[PDB]
Amino acid sequence: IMIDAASSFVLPISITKNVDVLQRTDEILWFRGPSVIVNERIINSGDPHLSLPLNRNEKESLPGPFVLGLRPSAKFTAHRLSMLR
């Protein structure tokens, strides 16, 4: 199992006309596999949607993925911006 493969490639034709949105070298970088989209980085480790307790067929349409991601409440953020100045 090797480590030092290249795994990125560049085509010789300068097509740099409509490409300011992609990832440029500074040309266009062309990798050997796709990307990986990760929804939320921090798992919410309790929350019986995920913990599955052993007590007591049901569906639930939760709002967004933001339930599973430890977001702070806004009153603390306003308190901290008041503590800013």
Binding site: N44, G46, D47, P48, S51, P72, S73, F76
Partner: protein, 97 residues
């Protein structure tokens, strides 16, 4: 004085092993990370009123259980490191000689 830092937040509890954080573990008394963040969030602002915190968590937690949780939060290392007749026997012989 230089001391190796007592890293309490990493250290797993010995006596109970059920009041740890949810990452170090392998009404309802479950205490998910959202209510834990809301608990530290209410303790930073409200400063021990125990009833604005008790519904800032979200109402499923009694005030007794919020005190039960607050008794097991780790303390800062820089606060642990912050709280923590032979005279006359010659004179009486030197006056004489």
């Amino acid at each position: 004085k230089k001391e190796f830092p007592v890293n309490l937040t990493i250290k797993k509890n010995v006596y109970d092993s059920a009041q740890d954080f949810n990452a170090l573990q392998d009404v309802k008394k479950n205490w998910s990370d959202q209510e834990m963040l809301l608990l530290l969030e209410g303790i930073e602002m409200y400063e021990d009123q125990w009833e604005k915190i008790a519904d800032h968590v979200g109402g499923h937690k009694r005030v007794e259980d919020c005190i039960e949780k607050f008794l097991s939060l780790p303390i800062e290392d820089n606060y642990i490191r912050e709280v923590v007749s032979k005279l006359m026997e010659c004179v009486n012989d030197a006056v004489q000689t």
